[PDB]
Curated annotation (Swiss-Prot), chains A, B:
It comes from Bacillus subtilis (strain 168). It comes from the Bacteria. The keyword DNA-binding applies. Coiled coil: none annotated. The gene is hxlR. GO terms for molecular function: DNA binding. This is HTH-type transcriptional activator HxlR.
Amino acid sequence: RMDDKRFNCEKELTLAVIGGKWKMLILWHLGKEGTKRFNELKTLIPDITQKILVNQLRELEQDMIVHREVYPVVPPKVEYSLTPHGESLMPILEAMYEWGKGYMELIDID
Amino acid sequence: RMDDKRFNCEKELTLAVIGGKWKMLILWHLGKEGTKRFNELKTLIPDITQKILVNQLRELEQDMIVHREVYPVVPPKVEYSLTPHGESLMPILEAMYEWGKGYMELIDID
């Protein structure tokens, strides 16, 4: 049957949502730390630039992975969190991390 | 600390081992079905060509993901299976598949 083409597309889709080097970092910290403000992510990933960070958060919110919420307190608070889909994505990223550690260990200690 | 750069490299390493459209298919069938002969993979992924399939299996065996074993019976049998690392990689691929299904459902039924 056509079970390969759909397996490929549905695994590829997850890869694109993960994308390049920046999206998975933002998710990782939101998953472990919880809600964070823009400044806080900016400093938890000091390698990231201001312009890149707003672009990645914007794609992630349109991709319904990251939720933005504004609390009109004094002064107002705008904080970022994971959509339920983002949370269901966290185990995968932790699994990939753990496998990378064990495989890098393997490569290193032949 | 430098916890991002190592998280990135160790997640990237897993992505490279997964690589493009062919390596994850071969693993998937070996994980679910078990040991398979070359012909059998060739037919379980009919889209693959002979030349591509031997290249991907060769990278996967050098990457210590796929194990090749020869049984000198009559006539001899050469069969492919997953190294323990390949088996520890299967849950990740099943998780990515399940997340892709639910996220594609989401995209589709807004």
